Symmetry: C6
Subunit: 85 residues, 6 copies
């Protein structure tokens, strides 16, 4: 199960990124994470082919609304790398 991540400057661009990821491919929204400085990350789960398509589409949609700081697809993520606590 690949992990898809999109980090934006501001929440509204992140909500748009998460919505566009869910509409583009069969991915599951894990949730959002905020680390301060306006940085918010949307995290998705699914097959590597679906995650790559979802992230590519999510970045394109978020760039029209706000600023995308970074994006990433981790094909084989290690245990608990998505659990930030």
């Amino acid at each position: 199960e690949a992990l898809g991540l999109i980090e934006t400057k501001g929440l509204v661009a992140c909500i748009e990124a998460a919505d566009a990821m869910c509409a583009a491919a069969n991915v599951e929204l894990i949730g959002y994470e905020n680390v301060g400085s306006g940085l918010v990350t949307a995290m998705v789960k699914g097959d590597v082919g679906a995650v790559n398509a979802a992230v590519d589409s999510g970045v394109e949609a978020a760039r029209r609304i706000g600023e995308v700081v970074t994006s990433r697809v981790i094909a084989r993520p290690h245990n608990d790398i998505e659990k930030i606590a």
Copy 2:
């Protein structure tokens, strides 16, 4: 789920103004606010896509007079 209206501002007072103007302009329901730090605050609204579009346009106009609107968006069919 019905349409989702979002207005993000730099400062809380501009966000409260945006939420008040969104409610006064159309038949929308205020879901609440979301704050992500660094002064960023988002007002969220629910309703028919036509009402949400009118509410966000009027909320952005009112918040721009008071403070800085960072971004705004209407998502017609949110996946939630």
Copy 3:
């Protein structure tokens, strides 16, 4: 229904001064404070529109001597729950 008074400052001390001056200037009730990060603090008051306008004008005047007032606003007819800064 009653009016909502808001004063946002950069720094807490200027906001506490604004809230104290609002309470001394008019028969308004201090709802509380809200902080959104980046030093942005908002003092919120409720009361009759005339009292709220006088309280905010005085709160802004007093806070400007101590620190920086970013923005101020009086909403005469605020909609329900617009002062509750939470997800719900």
Copy 4:
């Protein structure tokens, strides 16, 4: 909608960073018979020390607290409110 005055003065010191605020609070407590209410943080590194007590003691505490914090950090603002209204300290 009727705020009353509280029986004791309130002193405030806002510094850029926590260590300068802890120094300010310690110097306020050592300079006069004041009670530390606590600390409040509003972001951007702005930390506030709040004390209560007689106006004379509060003034002496805030003046001394500002002097001590300025040696190890930056004091952004300070203020003494002699007859503070009830709930202005509840943040």
Copy 5:
């Protein structure tokens, strides 16, 4: 003091930190303790294991995170003192 080494990578942004933690885990036998966020976008990934494995994991994690975002600082503490990793 303690037997297992501590590996730390601090980045500006969460995605670069997740990449650093993933690369650390893939490069050597290091267990991911977790993440720590102190505001201003600063996120830290923490690992533990043998000093040789931790040095290889941090070097690889920094290299991978630099391609994605900004690495603010990195460190391997060979003999960390007790409770140094517990942020209260």
Copy 6:
């Protein structure tokens, strides 16, 4: 007044604060109270002990943290007043 000195090192970033706390513990017989984070990357490491041990620990901790990151401020309070270290509540 507390029966022991308070040592404080505030850094910009957690990693330089962890380094400062580790160097403080290695330099003298001090006890790490814990960390306090106030946002904007500001992290403070707090230590307890005799004033001589605390002064040595803070000087060493500042030197080690300056190699890794940015030290915003440092302080040793020889006779700290009650509850000045309690940031929460």
